[PDB]
Design a protein around this ligand. Structure first.
Ligand SMILES: [Gd]
Ligand SMILES: [Gd]
Lengths: 272, 272
């Protein structure tokens, strides 16, 4: 898989320069399923670029890409080597030129993530990890923080893509409960992958979110774990890449505490 | 004032260097008015260095510094040339090694901000503005976004330092109201000064917060305005530096819509 990985880094770095030059130009913003569900020609271009290049080199491999799913493709994960991608994690940020945008690539075999590559383009920060081999950022080794007291923690989360009153109310109510424990604070950068990378560096103690997709988390998941973190479902069960829910934390104490305080939202699985 | 400004820039870089070394070291974390109201020895030494360096060149100027006020110095703003400083804007970020921390220096004459310097030390971005001269980041001129439609905007805000349930509930309901217009999103990097510089670069369309202090916004206020944006009170009225409230937007159209949607939170003024 090292070869695939080596290749993935080169691809991500390259896709990153396309995003990077694009962010300075005018964009034709399109809508997908709602007025806040955005896409640009750059997300589509980037995904097409990634997919042709990998299939050209790994014809037998499968793909799960955000925009191809939007175009008809189905997000079912088999045992087969699969490339899980969000051409631009932080699409909204991209549209606004908010400087937190990543190319996210996760590689799964036997339905378990083997490596991950997350390229925060505007900062020129390359985050990578290979199962059993470490988490790095521009060659520097990552380690999650040591914090076991929630009352001294810094959390990351996002507001979500739903604008339905009932759902928003649940998301804010979950926030409120955490906030009031109290915790040191809550931050929101606008990208699950970047948020999770902040946990892998020890900058944030934990990230949680409900409503994400497998492409948003496939790359960064392994980076948190290889940095010494844990992935868990918000239900307190085992992390499930297709569940639309995640808790990425420095340790299991913090993760179970968060699971405890928040209420789950009903969501349609990515494999349904 | 150019001279003063030229000297402020130098001091910012110097203090910026102290913060950056310290961030990777073990810290002495102390409490101020509560368990979530933090201070480190770095906050204190940077502020001391700044003031003692200023007083030396300009013995007759006045100072409003966060940690000094904390120490008994009052926060009364007079016509005298006054330096308004947050030695570390984003103290909580600093304690966690969350990479958004800034040195913020505002300089006011006749109760009006004449120039501001915000150094985001970790990113290495020097933001400066001088009334009537423009706003820059590392030598590149800034300009706010042109978005006039609230439904296509990206907002930045903070949850605040209060953990009083009534208050918390007001912050979140304010958020809910904006969220549901809907707006494209809401971000939080953990520092008023950096959040405001993101508006000045056109990365975010507007920033609002109730509960900041004059030292949190004095430096960044002039950056947004010289970038072509506006400062307004939450009433839709004129910006009042000592009021603990601000709307910093690309333009008056978005500024006024936000003012129209949010409810005021009662707070003690900096001058009370
Ligand atoms: Gd995306
Ligand atoms: Gd501070």
């Amino acid at each position: 898989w090292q070869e695939c990985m080596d290749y993935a880094v080169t691809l991500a770095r390259q896709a990153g320069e396309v995003v990077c030059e694009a962010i300075k130009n005018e964009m034709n913003v399109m809508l997908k399923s709602s007025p806040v569900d955005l896409v640009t020609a750059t997300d589509q271009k980037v995904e097409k670029m990634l997919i042709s290049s990998i299939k050209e080199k790994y014809p037998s491999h499968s793909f799960i890409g955000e925009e191809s799913v939007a175009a008809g493709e189905k997000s079912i994960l088999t045992d087969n080597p699969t490339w899980i991608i969000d051409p631009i994690d932080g699409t909204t940020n991209f549209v606004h030129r908010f400087p937190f945008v990543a190319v996210s690539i996760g590689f799964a075999v036997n339905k378990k993530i083997e490596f991950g590559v997350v390229y925060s383009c505007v900062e020129g920060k390359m985050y990578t990890a290979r199962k059993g081999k470490g988490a790095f950022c521009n060659g520097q080794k990552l380690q999650v923080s040591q914090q076991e007291d929630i009352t001294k923690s810094l959390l990351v989360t996002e507001l979500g893509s739903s604008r339905t009153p009932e759902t928003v109310r649940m998301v804010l109510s979950n926030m409120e409960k955490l906030f009031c424990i109290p915790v040191h604070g809550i931050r929101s950068v606008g990208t699950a992958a970047v948020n999770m990378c902040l946990v892998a560096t020890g900058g944030a103690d934990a990230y949680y979110e409900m409503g994400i997709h497998c492409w948003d988390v496939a790359g960064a998941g392994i980076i948190v774990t290889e940095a010494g973190g844990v992935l868990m479902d918000v239900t307190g069960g085992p992390f499930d890449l297709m569940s639309r829910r995640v808790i990425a934390a420095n340790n299991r104490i913090l993760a179970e505490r968060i699971a405890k305080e928040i209420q789950v939202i009903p969501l349609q699985r990515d494999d349904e």
